Symmetry: D3
Subunit: 147 residues, 6 copies
Amino acid sequence: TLHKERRIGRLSVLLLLNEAEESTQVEELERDGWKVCLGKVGSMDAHKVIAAIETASKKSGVIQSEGYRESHALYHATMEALHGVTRGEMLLGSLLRTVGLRFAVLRGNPYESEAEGDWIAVSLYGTIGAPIKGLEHETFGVGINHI
Amino acid sequence: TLHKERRIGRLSVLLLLNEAEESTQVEELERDGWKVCLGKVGSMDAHKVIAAIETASKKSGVIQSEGYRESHALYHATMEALHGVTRGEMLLGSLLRTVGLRFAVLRGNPYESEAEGDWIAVSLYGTIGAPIKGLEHETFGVGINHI
Amino acid sequence: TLHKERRIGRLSVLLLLNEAEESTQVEELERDGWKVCLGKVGSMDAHKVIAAIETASKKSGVIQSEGYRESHALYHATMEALHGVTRGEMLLGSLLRTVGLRFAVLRGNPYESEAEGDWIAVSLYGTIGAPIKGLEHETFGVGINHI
Amino acid sequence: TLHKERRIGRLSVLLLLNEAEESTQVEELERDGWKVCLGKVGSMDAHKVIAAIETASKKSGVIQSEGYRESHALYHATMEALHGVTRGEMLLGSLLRTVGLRFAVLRGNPYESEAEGDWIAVSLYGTIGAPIKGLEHETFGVGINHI
Amino acid sequence: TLHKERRIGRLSVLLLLNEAEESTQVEELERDGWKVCLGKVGSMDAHKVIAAIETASKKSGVIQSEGYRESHALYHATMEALHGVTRGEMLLGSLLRTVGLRFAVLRGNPYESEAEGDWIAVSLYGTIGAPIKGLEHETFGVGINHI
Amino acid sequence: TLHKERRIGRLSVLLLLNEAEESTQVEELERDGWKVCLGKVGSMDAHKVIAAIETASKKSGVIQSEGYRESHALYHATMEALHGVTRGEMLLGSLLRTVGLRFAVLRGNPYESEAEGDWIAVSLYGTIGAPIKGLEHETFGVGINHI
Ligand SMILES: N[C@@H](Cc1c[nH]c[nH+]1)C(=O)O
Ligand SMILES: N[C@@H](Cc1c[nH]c[nH+]1)C(=O)O
Ligand SMILES: N[C@@H](Cc1c[nH]c[nH+]1)C(=O)O
Ligand SMILES: N[C@@H](Cc1c[nH]c[nH+]1)C(=O)O
Ligand SMILES: N[C@@H](Cc1c[nH]c[nH+]1)C(=O)O
Ligand SMILES: N[C@@H](Cc1c[nH]c[nH+]1)C(=O)O
Ligand SMILES: [Mg+2]
Ligand SMILES: [Mg+2]
Ligand SMILES: [Mg+2]
Ligand SMILES: [Mg+2]
Ligand SMILES: [Mg+2]
Ligand SMILES: [Mg+2]
């Protein structure tokens, strides 16, 4: 049973969609026990987007830089988040489209039971469109996995 | 070029991730020129989710009840939103899973140029999991289409 | 190398798209060695479409009624054709859509080399849309396989 | 309700499949109000196919060169057409296959109701096969969208 | 780094494909620390296949019957295993096909490092074909996930 | 009806999951009427995997080098096998992952009836993971097609 005050997806997105400067949200989340990561990436290569999120997450300590288990968890969460962004074909450049994304990676236990352990949410928000500036619309994606 | 203050996708999600009995968000969006629709639907059948959204959108005036054009725009936007929710296979019950969703449909021009016309954003947020309460996690979906 | 005058795909589609009350196009195709099957099926169930095509193909003798080999070839060609019709998710009713289709199944050798043997083409044309009539547009699909 | 004499999909495919050295089928379509674009592209890169179609459609005036709305409509119709050609994975060269395509893009209102406005159809026909010539079969795809 | 003597996928499959009677393999695996589950399921409903594997796994203690975390791990492994079986469309009956499967669920650490924790492999083997006995060919699928 | 002692899929996997320097499995299979091919390939490009299999199959005599028919059968069998390996998106490098595979291709009649002709099974087994050694898990894929 998800804890209303700990809905990892909702929190990662509210953080991702907030454009305030005086921004205590990251601090607030961390104070509540969440591991947080924020970044940006623009590319016509999906592998670069995956690479950016992975690197940023490991450098911020959201997931372990050693071992495979957590990288595996993150990879599949990223893949799922990319589904909402690509909608059908997980291809960007090869389908003549590119993305300008902001991404948030949030790690923690979103349930009332401590036995559920840590879960990770990968949220993406930005634009997807032609290689030409302006010709685009928004894109969104949230992937959640146990970790 | 997307108008910074009229990012329909971002606005539709934020509207959905809001939990203030007295937000006045809907009215505020309507006063800014947006046609807004909110609803909820729980089911193991994707077709019931699609139908709820279409019914709510037509009843609220978000899209014309007559003609195919707007219904077509909404259907595809709904399909794109379902991609983020289903991530790979647009199936619920047949894959032994179910959803509990809140949905928002916004309709207006998110671009700086009036020539871009109206666009529609279907946003979904809730849970997806086994038919058993508690065994589930969050799910998001955002589809954007022109009208 | 495809024989210019034996393009099984093109031929099956021309037959499918041309309303010839007279001048049996089927007779001409058969006179040239092609085995031909034509039919129509309307449904919100893809399995009924697949079934209609199989039954009609076997009844007309386009594929053997006994054995698996030929049914296997036909099934896959049918699946490939359905991809053009469904465009992403091979689902109809579960996604609140229905099809009204006319289908053609052609069998013969479309290559200059006789050693290539028989191939089969399954072609579909009609409409796909909401259950309510009027809300729909055209749909097409062609699947080709060796047999 | 689709106008029997204005089936944009069927018309785009007939144009595509019929080799008319004389009697300009294009002139007749244009005389009836349709905006038409024809072209050919051979490649192992789907983005070049998409690009060829967009450039040709804009050059011929089938869709506006400025703005995003119409390019958006065309892009999605192109994607839908590619589904019939690729049947599962919208990949060409990365899966060791290449296409030789002829394409047609038609724009007009295919419905009895003038209120429906313009719709667009992207149709593709040609071959798909191994890089080595001779090893290939036909491929088709039709995408329809409102614009 | 995978441990050659502990390759969870390979082991689950060798167990699944072994048709011996005097069968000490399950005992051998369990003696080595693996949690093992074996079953059979024939159906035209993918949800029944997923249901069978889940139930069998929980009744055999391969995964916890309480909580969501492990059910989540198993569900996604099952989904991945089903990809090899369905190859493109995770649909059975709706696409007029059915399966007769044997399944093995193996849980344990396949790496040299103990820090990798438990992983789960879901292996499927049997036939997939028409609803008629005989008209079918073999099908295989292996899904691996951390747990 | 599949011949219990000639289950091509099962035989191809078992052949691949074997690690005896002196198994004599290949010769034993060839003496039972099967055409056999074994190979290995590591890459971040699916097209290189497809090419290795095709090259190995033609060089070993598993399929004819001339004509398209057998190449077509093999290509689709290879594609079906890749589904189990890629599970959803038939992409490797573009999704920042790579494979280290062993493959086996068997060709013969697995049915009790000689009228079913020859069929081909492409089996894949190895690892899929990040471009970094150690960060990966097992992957399987089996594709079956008629010739
Ligand atoms: N609109 C496309 C992106 C795009 C490509 N070219 C123009 N727009 C999408 O939904 O992904
Ligand atoms: N977790 C699954 C849903 C589910 C089914 N059973 C348990 N969970 C998903 O990502 O859709
Ligand atoms: N537009 C949908 C069909 C549809 C469903 N509802 C309305 N139209 C398609 O492209 O398949
Ligand atoms: N047969 C493949 C094309 C191909 C690749 N190599 C040989 N043929 C298809 O259906 O797309
Ligand atoms: N051969 C089909 C199954 C089938 C359905 N009907 C006959 N066979 C497959 O590859 O899944
Ligand atoms: N685990 C991924 C592969 C991978 C990429 N990076 C790490 N692992 C899969 O299931 O394909
Ligand atoms: Mg999940
Ligand atoms: Mg449509
Ligand atoms: Mg098959
Ligand atoms: Mg778009
Ligand atoms: Mg994995
Ligand atoms: Mg083919």
